[PDB]
Amino acid sequence: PYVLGTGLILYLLSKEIYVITPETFSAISTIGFLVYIVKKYGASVGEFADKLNEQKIA
Amino acid sequence: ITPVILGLPLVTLIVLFPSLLFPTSNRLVSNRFVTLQQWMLQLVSKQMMSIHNSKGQTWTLMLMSLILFIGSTNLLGLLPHSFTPTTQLSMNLGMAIPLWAGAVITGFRNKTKASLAHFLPQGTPTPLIPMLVIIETISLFIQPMALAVRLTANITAGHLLIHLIGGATLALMSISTTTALITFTILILLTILEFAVAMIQAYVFTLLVSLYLHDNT
Amino acid sequence: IDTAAKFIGAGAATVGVAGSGAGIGTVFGSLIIGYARNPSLKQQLFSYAILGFALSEAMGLFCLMVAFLILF
Amino acid sequence: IDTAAKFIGAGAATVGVAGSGAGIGTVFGSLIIGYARNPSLKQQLFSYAILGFALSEAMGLFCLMVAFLILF
Amino acid sequence: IDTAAKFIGAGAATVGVAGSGAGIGTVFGSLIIGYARNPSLKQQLFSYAILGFALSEAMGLFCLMVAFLILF
Amino acid sequence: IDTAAKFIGAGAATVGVAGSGAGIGTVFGSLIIGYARNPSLKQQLFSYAILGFALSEAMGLFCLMVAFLILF
Amino acid sequence: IDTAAKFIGAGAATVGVAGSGAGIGTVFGSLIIGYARNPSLKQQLFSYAILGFALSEAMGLFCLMVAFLILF
Amino acid sequence: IDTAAKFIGAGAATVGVAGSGAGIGTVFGSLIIGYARNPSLKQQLFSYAILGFALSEAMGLFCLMVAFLILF
Amino acid sequence: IDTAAKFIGAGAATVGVAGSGAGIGTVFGSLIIGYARNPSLKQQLFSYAILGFALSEAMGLFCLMVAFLILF
Amino acid sequence: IDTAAKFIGAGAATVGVAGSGAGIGTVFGSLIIGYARNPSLKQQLFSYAILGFALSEAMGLFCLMVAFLILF
Amino acid sequence: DIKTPELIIGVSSDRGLCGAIHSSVAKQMKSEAANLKEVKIIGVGDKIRSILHRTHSDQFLVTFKEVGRRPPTFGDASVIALELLNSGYEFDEGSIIFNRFRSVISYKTEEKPIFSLDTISSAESMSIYDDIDADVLRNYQEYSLANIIYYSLKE
Amino acid sequence: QMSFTFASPTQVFFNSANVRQVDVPTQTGAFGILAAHVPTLQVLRPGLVVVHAEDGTTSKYFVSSGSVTVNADSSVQLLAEEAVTLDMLDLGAAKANLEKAQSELLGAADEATRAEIQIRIEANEALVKAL
Amino acid sequence: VAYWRQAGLSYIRYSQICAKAVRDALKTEFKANAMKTSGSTIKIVKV
């Protein structure tokens, strides 16, 4: 969860610091990012289960 | 200065944290933090290692660094905007030398006259025909190295067309949003479906090609 | 001359989408007869169809990047 | 020149429908040879022929948008 | 400029039929090779070749209407 | 201009016979593959090859009509 | 213009020889993959190879007739 | 004439990407209709698919370097 | 016009070499998928491939002499 | 005129390299389905595929030489 | 069904006529021999090679022994099949005559015909068939030669 | 559906069972022969018989050789020379054989001789493949 | 065709090597049975 939040912040900095698109384009990209999230947050937990168990087993 | 100078350092640091964080995960902590990020290179060492070795461990991590660097570089052009039209193009040209040099390191440096002697002796290039070996030295390097520049420009365009079609769709239907929002919504998501995928597959080409080099090397 | 040849030259680059559209009918058609011999529908076959159409429409998005660079 | 190059430029963009035209005959051709191998006609096979005629007429709709941009 | 470019606009719009004629050869070929494997000829398969030779000529009537628009 | 663009437009329409030429080869090639699978050469399969050369030369006669209209 | 367009119009009909040259590559290809199935090499298949390369070169000899007519 | 013809000269060289567009669909499509016959997917076939896609984007690395030469 | 459009008329006549190049790929492909059935390598299938690549680049030598007539 | 239509003559000569790109996929794609029947990889079929890649990219070399002729 | 206007092969044990096995085929194979198939005989059972054994010291292609002593198995069928293949049959229409057992108390002296003329096996109605190659054809004929063989023998 | 006869001389697995599919690696190829096939004859490549009965289940066997012949009608007869379940098939042997198989191959001879190995290689491999 | 077919062999020959090869394989228990299964208790009489 903490990682995800850090990555979002960095992007925002880049957009503001760097040359920017149109407002409409930008607004959308942010919406576009959101859609992936909801599946992802369930996915991120699932990711967690696999690797640390595979690490623990070995 | 700051903008151009800030962009390349910024790129590095996003790859650097994963590249530091995973080395770090080899004993601590993990809490939430370390294990979370170990996830990043474990996705690299999970996902990309499903393709690698393959060429063998020796080259494997050498190429995976460029693959991750390209995908991460383009992810660092994904997010920032404006960034793709300028900085990602300068990063595509800054990835151009790495893409050229990736064949150079072992191919042209050890055999410039026939870097296909490392890459592909018999295949595309005719091994019976050193002329076709040098000709396809372009289609397996000189060009493929220009393609790797065109490949990022292929992404730039598709990313651009999303912005242009987007901005043109919202410029066309400045309704607030309304029906253009629905399509415009897609047009952004097309940025991921187009650039962020084809970007990836783009470095995947440099992967596989520098694999087919070092795998026969 | 500087604006006229920019409208009839952005039309000749729109004929480069003739390869991305006929190629898409070859990347999906050879997937129709592919799953006809069967059976790996989800994964393997249709997964290779997505990585093929992405490498088919890439010559359509880059050709529409040289089209929109002549009119905008 | 201003009304000339947009009238000959809208004609060159109509050569992008030659890809979707033959690309529609192939996706509906491999479905004719696929259902010849039988028998999952309704659902699976003929339900994918719509997914193959949509990704092929998407470049056609992208080409018919260009020819209508120089015509209106 | 006005009288000339409309003649060099319906000429390049006739190069969109180059898919409707070859794609019909692709679908009617796949029905020619499909009926060889047998036996649904007077039903099922040759009734899908009419649905294929139409969708191919569907980009052959849409392209032909643009060449008839630039002329008259 | 008016007696000029008629010659640089009637020639571009002859590039529409590229689908009629490559459609005749594909419809006959799969007929040569369909009669290689045997056995209904006399009617049924090669009879349908005439019904495939007609629906493929129709997109070549309609394209040759537009080329003849811009020349005479 | 009156002398210029005939030269630009002869080359444009010479692009219609790209359909006849690939339609001969499909008819002789499907005869090369139609003789591997065996055994009637002489007659039937390769006897219809010239009968399939006659209707496909018929689009080329008509196109190179429209290219020569704008030259003489 | 000098700067005007450099705009409708890299646009006609952009329609050369239609060969690489459908050539990548014919190459990857045959690999989807090849691994369906199974089972040498990992290496042998998909490894050869990276040799065929590079030799098809080789013409794409020589046609996009042509239009980028008439630009700057 | 006279010493101009013949230089852009030899460019359009060199587009006819898209059928002699894509006809060789269709010919020298079915004689690679047909020899996979085996075992008529010499004397039969590859011998007919010499007579397959003889009527393929015959439309290309006729397209290389059409461009040579618009130069020398 | 002399410097103008030489730039629009090299561009249409680069469209003749659309046959080699789609010829490269249809020749190295039939060998991607030949080894799927197996097992002549690095023997007969992959050896003839290089002799099929050379016969198709030569029609791309004989077309890029026309594009280099109208450029230097 | 694939039938021509145009071998034979006795099948049994090496051990006597504990039924009318050998004699039956003997009969019907002598019945045969005139008629034209090919007069090639294979005798499974060398008690075949008794009942017919004279110019069935001269009409056989092969004969088989250790017929029983552990009931025949597929292997055998294949075995006998295998060498059979490599035979100077001019693979006419072959017959396999054996006694198909019918029940504890009943058997029937059989024949089946072998579409050894693989070409009848190519012909006709056999067309709709696919994997039609004189390969899988033969290569079924092959397989079936054992299958049948096995069976018959077992019968 | 299909009378699917999955049989082997020794084992009939399915007996005219209205099976939806058998995925079937004839040397012809791997296919999903579905309930009621077209006249076709097939040679069994060693592979698996994946027996999609009308039951969701698809059963594994690895098959050595034989025929499935997928008929004009709806009879499918896998006539397996020997088609066995991985259950009873020993990887330990298979792999071991298989490496060996190539090893032996290296000292083998003619098309046939090599073949004996190669066939095996192929086979054992395809078992190893399978498991 | 094959390295077999053109080595002649047969589908039998092929097959048998498969079949055998399976016999070669299997888990040992099952290998007990092996010899039962498609053995050949024969004298191959040559006539």
Structure description:
The structure is cut from a larger assembly and holds 1 copy of chain A (58 residues), 1 copy of chain B (217 residues), 8 copies of chain C (72 residues), 1 copy of chain K (155 residues), 1 copy of chain L (131 residues) and 1 copy of chain M (47 residues). Chain B has helices at 2-24, 31-47, 57-75, 84-94, 96-110, 116-119, 130-172, 179-216. Chain B has 217 residues and is mainly alpha-helical. The longest helix of chain C is centred in the middle third of the chain and has 13 residues, at 41-53. Chain C has one domain (1-72): F1FO ATP Synthase. Chain C is elongated, with a radius of gyration of 17 Å. Chain C contains 5 helices and no strands. In chain M, 51% of the residues are buried. Strand 2 (60-65) of chain K pairs antiparallel with strand 1 of chain M. It is classed as hydrolase. Keywords: hydrolase, ATP synthase, rotary atpase. The entry is titled "Bovine mitochondrial ATP synthase state 3a".
Domains of chain L, number: 2
Number of distinct beta strands of chain L: 9
CATH homologous group name of the largest domain in chain L: F0F1 ATP synthase delta/epsilon subunit, N-terminal
The appropriate CATH architecture of the largest domain in chain L is: Sandwich
CATH homologous superfamily label of chain M: ATP synthase, F1 complex, epsilon  subunit superfamily, mitochondrial
State the order of secondary-structure elements of chain M, H for helix, E for strand: HHE
Question: Could you write a compact summary of the structure shown?
Answer:
This is part of a larger assembly, with one copy of chain A (58 residues), one copy of chain B (217 residues), eight copies of chain C (72 residues), one copy of chain K (155 residues), one copy of chain L (131 residues) and one copy of chain M (47 residues). Chain A is an all-alpha fold.
Observed structural traits:
part of a larger assembly, 13 chains, B: 217 residues, mainly alpha, 8 helices, M: mainly alpha, Atp Synthase Epsilon Chain, Chain: I, 45% helix, hydrolase, ATP synthase, rotary atpase, ATP synthase F(0) complex subunit B1, mitochondrial, ATP synthase subunit beta, mitochondrial
What is the strand and helix layout of this fold?
The structure is cut from a larger assembly and holds one copy of chain A (58 residues), one copy of chain B (217 residues), eight copies of chain C (72 residues), one copy of chain K (155 residues), one copy of chain L (131 residues) and one copy of chain M (47 residues).
Chain B lengths: L1 H23 L6 H17 L9 H19 L8 H11 L1 H15 L5 H4 L10 H43 L6 H38 L1
Helix pairs in contact in B: 1-2, 1-3, 3-8, 4-7, 5-7, 5-8, 7-8
Chain C lengths: L17 H5 L1 H4 L1 H4 L8 H13 L4 H4 L11
Chain K lengths: L20 H14 L6 E4 L3 H4 L8 E6 L8 H12 L8 E3 L2 E5 L2 E4 L2 E3 L19 H21 L1
Parallel strand pairs in K: 1-2
Antiparallel strand pairs in K: 3-6, 4-5
Helix pairs in contact in K: 3-4
Organism (chains C, D, E, F, G, H, I, J): Bos taurus (Bovine)
Catalytic activity (chains C, D, E, F, G, H, I, J): H(+)(in) = H(+)(out)
Protein name (chains C, D, E, F, G, H, I, J): ATP synthase F(0) complex subunit C1, mitochondrial
